[PDB]
Design a protein around this nucleic acid. Structure first.
Lengths: 141, 140
DNA sequence: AATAACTTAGCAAGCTAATTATA
DNA sequence: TTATAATTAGCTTGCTAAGTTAT
């Protein structure tokens, strides 16, 4: 038969290794990219919880990442006036310079990774991924 | 489309699931993958061989073996030809857990792949191998 | 002297449970 | 009271770099 579960596992692992590598010259990690990509793509002034839910990671995972970005002056936490419990995640000015460059390395690489795949074979793949994630999300209950 | 993170998230929950469906066997997905692989290779593998098979660095495999060894599920015997290496062999206590195990798996693999033409599968499996391919090249 | 197999130590980034402060 | 956002503390299992023994 076919070890598809571990084969995906291994795919993601090396895919990470690659992105991690193509970013090292920017002092960045895949894990940073994913968080930044997501801020720069949501209605500004998100709460962390919102952002977390967007990215698909529990809030603690997101905490560590924000902490790191904050110590590189790439993000800002400001307490939510309406809900003094929450925080507004906003990008800094120092951020847009790293983003342009970044989304390129990515873009560049996304192409290099998807070499030889009909945009249909892609959209299909993308369908199945969402479907698999679907079935699993159900057996959770 | 955020395909890189979407795969990331897929694997993560898929792991969570298998991890769960095994907890009653005291096992982890990570254990399954190592055991599945021994019970599928010419007996008397070196760890390095086994590692290369599984697709993990040798240290990763060290920790896992250590755990299986403290559950008496595997054996390390030093290679006579190369006193540097070790022969990984399953114990007798092992076959009982394996049958049960490969079932939970089998059972679940079916439940996970609900509604996918065996072609859509084989295709998926093609693309996976292809993506892994392109990446493995940009490594050089 | 160099390389190799396994081990060790410690980092990375997910996660769950538990704390703290505010609604 | 009770529940909710952000955090902290600690597990897991991958990694890489450095150590040990044997080739």
């Amino acid at each position: 038969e076919s070890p598809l579960g571990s084969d995906l596992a291994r795919l993601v692992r090396i895919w990470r290794a690659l992105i991690d590598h193509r970013l090292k010259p920017l002092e960045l990690t895949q894990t940073h990219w994913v968080t930044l990509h997501n801020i720069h793509q949501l209605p500004p002034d998100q709460s962390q919880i919102q952002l977390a839910k967007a990215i698909g990671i529990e809030q603690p995972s997101l905490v560590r990442t924000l902490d790191q970005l904050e110590d590189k002056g790439l993000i800002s936490r400001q307490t939510c006036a309406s809900d003094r419990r929450a925080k507004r995640i906003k990008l800094t000015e120092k951020a847009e310079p790293l983003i342009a460059e970044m989304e390129e390395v990515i873009h560049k690489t996304r192409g290099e990774i998807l070499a030889g795949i009909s945009s249909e074979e892609i959209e299909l793949l993308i369908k199945l991924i969402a479907k698999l994630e679907h079935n699993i999300m159900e057996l959770h209950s």
